[PDB]
């Protein structure tokens with residue numbers, strides 16, 4: 063039950079931070095995961111985006127947003143004229159949490175508890191201290207609550223620029239849906255979910 067804090071080194075070097083996250087024992091999730099999935103991008107990024115946790119594909123690659131949700135994220139970024147390669151993209155929890163299907167190898171993603179999110183939050187703080195983003199997009203409720211408190215309501219602040227204490231640099235925060243949700247439902251449901259995410263990404267990119 064320790065939390066990640068005493069496993070986080072005092073450095074802004076992202077490769078050093080990523081290796082240290084591989085050695086983190088701040089919660090139980092390191093055990094069955096393949097590896098840490100640290101954030102991806104350069105310190106030169108001025109927009110950071112934060113999801114929930116790895117999926118199966120992310121866990122195998124050691125990279126964020128490489129599966130189907132990442133594909134739809136990329137499509138929405140393109141619609142918002144945002145270059146993904148200029149971003150820093152990461153997740154609130156850095157080890158894949160899952161159960162195995164009975165009788166097989168298939169891994170079923172399971173959502174981190176609030177305790178696991180808080181345990182892993184010091185890595186987000188180190189990432190923000192390193193990258194110094196102007197704006198942070200919180201992709202989904204888990205990432206939003208990680209910075210804005212466990213009773214934060216994404217539905218009550220769509221399109222709003224937020225700020226909160228204990229976030230390095232006091233960046234603009236924009237809380238939106240997680241891109242996995244854009245995979246759901248028939249044509250018009252997907253198209254409305256897409257539009258809503260694009261609107262929020264544009265708010266974030268237009269912060270000046």
Ligand code: SF4
Pocket residue numbers: 065066083086087088089090091092098155156157181182185
């Ligand atoms: S999930 Fe986060 S806190 Fe838990 S072990 Fe992995 S890095 Fe450490």
